[PDB]
Amino acid sequence: MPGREILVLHVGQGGNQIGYNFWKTICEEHNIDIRSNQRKSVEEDKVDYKSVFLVEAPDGFHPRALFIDLEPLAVEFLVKEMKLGSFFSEDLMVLSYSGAHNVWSIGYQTGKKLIPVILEKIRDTMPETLQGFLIIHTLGGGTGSGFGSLLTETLKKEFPGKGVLNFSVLPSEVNDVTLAPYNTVLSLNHLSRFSDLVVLFDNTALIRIVKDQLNYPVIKQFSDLNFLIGRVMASITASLRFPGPLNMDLMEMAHNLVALPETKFIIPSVAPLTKEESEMSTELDLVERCFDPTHYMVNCSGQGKTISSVLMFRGNIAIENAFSIMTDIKSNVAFAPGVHPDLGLKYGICESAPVDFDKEVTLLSNNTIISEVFNRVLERFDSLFNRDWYTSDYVNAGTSKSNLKEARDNFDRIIKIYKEIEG
Ligand SMILES: Nc1nc2c(ncn2[C@@H]2O[C@H](COP(=O)(O)OP(=O)(O)O)[C@@H](O)[C@H]2O)c(=O)[nH]1
Ligand code: NA
Numbered sequence: 001m002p003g004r005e006i007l008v009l010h011v012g013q014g015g016n017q018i019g020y021n022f023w024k025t026i027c028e029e030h031n032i033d034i035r036s037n038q039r040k041s042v043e044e045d046k047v048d049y050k051s052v053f054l055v056e057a058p059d060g061f062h063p064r065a066l067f068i069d070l071e072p073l074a075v076e077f078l079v080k081e082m083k084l085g086s087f088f089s090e091d092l093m094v095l096s097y098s099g100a101h102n103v104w105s106i107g108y109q110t111g112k113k114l115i116p117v118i119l120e121k122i123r124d125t126m127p128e129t130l131q132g133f134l135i136i137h138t139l140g141g142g143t144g145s146g147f148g149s150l151l152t153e154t155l156k157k158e159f160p161g162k163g164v165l166n167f168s169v170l171p172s173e174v175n176d177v178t179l180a181p182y183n184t185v186l187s188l189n190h191l192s193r194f195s196d197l198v199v200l201f202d203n204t205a206l207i208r209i210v211k212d213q214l215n216y217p218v219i220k221q222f223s224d225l226n227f228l229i230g231r232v233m234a235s236i237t238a239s240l241r242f243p244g245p246l247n248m249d250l251m252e253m254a255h256n257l258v259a260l261p262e263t264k265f266i267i268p269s270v271a272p273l274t275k276e277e278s279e280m281s282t283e284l285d286l287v288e289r290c291f292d293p294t295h296y297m298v299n300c301s302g303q304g305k306t307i308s309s310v311l312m313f314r315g316n317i318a319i320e321n322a323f324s325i326m327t328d329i330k331s332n333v334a335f336a337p338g339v340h341p342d343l344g345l346k347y348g349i350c351e352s353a354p355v356d357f358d359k360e361v362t363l364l365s366n367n368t369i370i371s372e373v374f375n376r377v378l379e380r381f382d383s384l385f386n387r388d389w390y391t392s393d394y395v396n397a398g399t400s401k402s403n404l405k406e407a408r409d410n411f412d413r414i415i416k417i418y419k420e421i422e423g
């Protein structure tokens with residue numbers, strides 16, 4: 001049946017590398033090997049709706065996605081190493097050759113030449129019942145930040161009735177790109193006007209989670225980092241792909257989170273993170289872990305104040321526990337002073353657990369602690385802007401020094417709005 005379709009757009013090196021973990025997770029959950037595009041079997045094929053992310057074809061299943069970048073090596077070396085040629089096909093690749101050089105303005109301007117080709121690929125493979133788009137990118141670089149902001153502005157303008165949701169990767173506590181404060185403020189300022197929901201991550205928290213919650217002995221490639229982002233994307237969309245007592249789509253979750261038009265910046269968290277922990281935990285254990293800063297995928301100093309949260313229960317869930325613990329959540333977890341004791345929670349329940357897991361809870365939190373995370377970016381921004389450092393290559397690419405003051409002021413307004421609701 002038509003409807004519920006979603007198109008994903010991967011921009012830059014990070015956005016495409018995260019894309020491998022996401023599509024590997026989607027295929028595994030739908031009993032599909034990503035190598036031959038086939039069903040693994042008919043006996044293990046479950047009552048589901050593969051059409052959310054997958055496109056059915058005679059040879060097999062393909063992703064409803066676009067793999068976009070301003071240089072060809074990050075995507076190609078990914079497909080060669082992981083052997084994704086049959087799935088990450090050439091017809092889904094929008095590549096160019098010049099690169100963005102970690103400059104948001106260059107990625108924005110250069111990406112404008114690929115917009116006509118991107119639209120035509122969308123205008124063909126898109127069902128008119130498509131419910132929205134997901135844009136996967138990093139904010140500290142150039143292509144994911146600049147071109148990604150461009151695809152956010154474009155799609156929201158091109159398809160006003162559809163949801164445009166961003167999954168954005170913040171720089172680590174110490175940025176591994178010196179230009180990141182410029183690229184992050186420009187991206188966040190752009191997404192605040194054209195995006196419906198911005199789900200944020202950073203590598204410091206992702207690394208902390210992998211080392212402390214999964215106990216990996218080493219992290220050698222980003223695949224041992226990006227699987228957390230793919231787990232969030234797959235689990236928050238699980239009710240759209242499998243049976244459940246309580247389903248929810250993209251804009252349903254967005255409408256429950258965005259209290260004020262500017263409060264669209266979300267912090268995700270998942271618990272548990274190993275198989276053996278899903279079998280001995282309770283719904284109260286997982287929810288408490290999700291609301292604990294040790295499980296936030298954004299590096300935060302504390303629990304903060306929750307404005308509004310979306311909770312997805314997957315798998316072997318006791319419904320009576322999920323509802324009875326709501327008073328414990330409202331009493332133990334700090335919420336914004338304006339949140340009524342009976343509000344701030346949006347529930348989703350899916351009978352399909354993540355692969356090999358007994359159960360799992362995914363949290364999407366609209367937290368005032370975003371003001372603290374954003375104030376760090378602004379402080380890094382001002383340290384460079386007040387000294388006129390690295391501004392020439394942004395001015396030479398269309399972004400005036402006045403424009404950098406425009407995006408920064410509007411970015412500071414977002415901080416103060418989150419500050420004011422906090423009390
Ligand atoms: N989590 C994650 N972060 C990444 C990945 N690749 C790059 N980054 C981060 O993104 C920033 C660099 O942006 P990048 O995507 O490499 O440049 P771009 O191709 O111009 O978008 C740095 O802060 C990196 O730490 C990835 O695969 N996973
Ligand atoms: Na790059």
Ligand code: NA
Nearest residue numbers: 013101102141
């Ligand atoms: Na790069």
